[PDB]
Amino acid sequence: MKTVKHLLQEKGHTVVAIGPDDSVFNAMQKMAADNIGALLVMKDEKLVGILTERDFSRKSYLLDKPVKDTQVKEIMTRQVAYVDLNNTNEDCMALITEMRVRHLPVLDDGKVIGLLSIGDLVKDAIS
Amino acid sequence: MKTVKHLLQEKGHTVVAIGPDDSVFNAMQKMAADNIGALLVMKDEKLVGILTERDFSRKSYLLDKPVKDTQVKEIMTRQVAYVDLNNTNEDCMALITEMRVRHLPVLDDGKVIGLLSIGDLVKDAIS
Numbered sequence: 001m002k003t004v005k006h007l008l009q010e011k012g013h014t015v016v017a018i019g020p021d022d023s024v025f026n027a028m029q030k031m032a033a034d035n036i037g038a039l040l041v042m043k044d045e046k047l048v049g050i051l052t053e054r055d056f057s058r059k060s061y062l063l064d065k066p067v068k069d070t071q072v073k074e075i076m077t078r079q080v081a082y083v084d085l086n087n088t089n090e091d092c093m094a095l096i097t098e099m100r101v102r103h104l105p106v107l108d109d110g111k112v113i114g115l116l117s118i119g120d121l122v123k124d125a126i127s
Numbered sequence: 128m129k130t131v132k133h134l135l136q137e138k139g140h141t142v143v144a145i146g147p148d149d150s151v152f153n154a155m156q157k158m159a160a161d162n163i164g165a166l167l168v169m170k171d172e173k174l175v176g177i178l179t180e181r182d183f184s185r186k187s188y189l190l191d192k193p194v195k196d197t198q199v200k201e202i203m204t205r206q207v208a209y210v211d212l213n214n215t216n217e218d219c220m221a222l223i224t225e226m227r228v229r230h231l232p233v234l235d236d237g238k239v240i241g242l243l244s245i246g247d248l249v250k251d252a253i254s
């Protein structure tokens with residue numbers, strides 16, 4: 001049994017973010033640049049959503065508008081499931097599997113301090 | 128250690144496919160309807176590619192054409208890692224982690240008989 005604190009230590013404390021009013025083009029370019037599949041959507045230090053590859057895959061082409069003309073807020077997930085430092089690997093795997101989400105932001109006392117994904121949990125398990 | 132055959136028994140042998148000449152619009156509608164993130168791209172028995180949410184997210188908007196004018200073959204992954212009934216859950220995962228692919232078609236004697244994803248492996252791990 002491993003804590004989220006320790007899972008984050010293994011993985012790193014990078015938080016890659018974007019603003020809700022930025023373009024989906026810029027968002028998808030940023031995911032490509034970092035080879036990631038999610039962005040924390042931050043406004044005035046508030047986590048207002050998460051933008052994922054699934055959000056893009058499901059929503060973007062259904063808008064009668066190009067990606068440069070769509071804002072992140074239009075397609076982001078607004079209800080964000082997250083974990084805290086005292087949650088465990090068991091908790092993460094259950095949330096990922098049963099909620100069917102690939103990313104779990106990590107929140108500490110009001111601050112987004114990291115992100116864990118399904119790939120992190122797989123990597124930790126096989127290491 | 129578990130066999131791929133065992134894993135596929137748990138998962139079931141459903142294969143959701145699309146043809147290479149079909150439109151990306153139709154492909155993404157099909158992923159949405161089935162709540163999946165990949166389609167196997169077949170020409171008769173031949174696995175010619177896999178179209179994934181990541182293909183869509185990385186490639187689609189960069190093309191010099193709209194999605195309804197784009198064919199699956201234009202953005203699908205042609206180089207498709209796969210497992211067979213000689214493989215194990217360990218092989219799966221290692222390959223998922225090392226190659227950064229979330230889906231593995233399962234073949235037996237040269238025929239696509241199913242698909243295993245990162246979510247299937249994680250679900251098996253917490254079973």
Ligand SMILES: NC(=O)c1ccc[n+]([C@@H]2O[C@H](COP(=O)([O-])OP(=O)(O)OC[C@H]3O[C@@H](n4cnc5c(N)ncnc54)[C@H](O)[C@@H]3O)[C@@H](O)[C@H]2O)c1
Binds near residue numbers: 040114119
């Ligand atoms: N070889 C490795 O070290 C390793 C690590 C992670 C994932 N993977 C593989 O890559 C593929 C995709 O991974 P995934 O489904 O986990 O999703 P993903 O592509 O979003 O995750 C990749 C990595 O980026 C991190 N990440 C994603 N969004 C982030 C954000 N906004 N801020 C900070 N970090 C962020 C994750 O924590 C993970 O470490 C899978 O096939 C997986 O198995 C491999």
Ligand SMILES: NC(=O)c1ccc[n+]([C@@H]2O[C@H](COP(=O)([O-])OP(=O)(O)OC[C@H]3O[C@@H](n4cnc5c(N)ncnc54)[C@H](O)[C@@H]3O)[C@@H](O)[C@H]2O)c1
Binds near residue numbers: 244245246
């Ligand atoms: N609770 C569950 O039974 C369960 C099972 C699998 C995945 N998940 C979760 O759902 C989310 C998405 O899953 P994922 O990242 O593994 O990718 P995914 O959405 O593509 O996979 C979802 C399911 O569909 C199947 N699938 C995908 N493409 C298929 C195809 N073309 N033909 C036949 N079957 C296909 C997979 O094998 C998997 O069982 C993740 O959060 C994951 O942890 C939950």
Ligand SMILES: [Br-]
Binds near residue numbers: 011012013014
């Ligand atoms: Br770090």
Ligand SMILES: [Br-]
Binds near residue numbers: 015
């Ligand atoms: Br950032």
Ligand SMILES: [Br-]
Binds near residue numbers: 019020021022043
């Ligand atoms: Br903004």
Ligand SMILES: [Br-]
Binds near residue numbers: 043073
């Ligand atoms: Br907002």
Ligand SMILES: [Br-]
Binds near residue numbers: 052053054055102
């Ligand atoms: Br996603």
Ligand SMILES: [Br-]
Binds near residue numbers: 026
């Ligand atoms: Br832009």
Ligand SMILES: [Br-]
Binds near residue numbers: 076077079
């Ligand atoms: Br939402």
Ligand SMILES: [Br-]
Binds near residue numbers: 054101102103
């Ligand atoms: Br997701």
Ligand SMILES: [Br-]
Binds near residue numbers: 128129130
């Ligand atoms: Br077995």
Ligand SMILES: [Br-]
Binds near residue numbers: 142143144145
């Ligand atoms: Br089908």
Ligand SMILES: [Br-]
Binds near residue numbers: 145146147148149
């Ligand atoms: Br076709």
Ligand SMILES: [Br-]
Binds near residue numbers: 147175200
């Ligand atoms: Br082809």
Ligand SMILES: [Br-]
Binds near residue numbers: 172238
């Ligand atoms: Br056949």
Ligand SMILES: [Br-]
Binds near residue numbers: 172173174237
């Ligand atoms: Br063949």
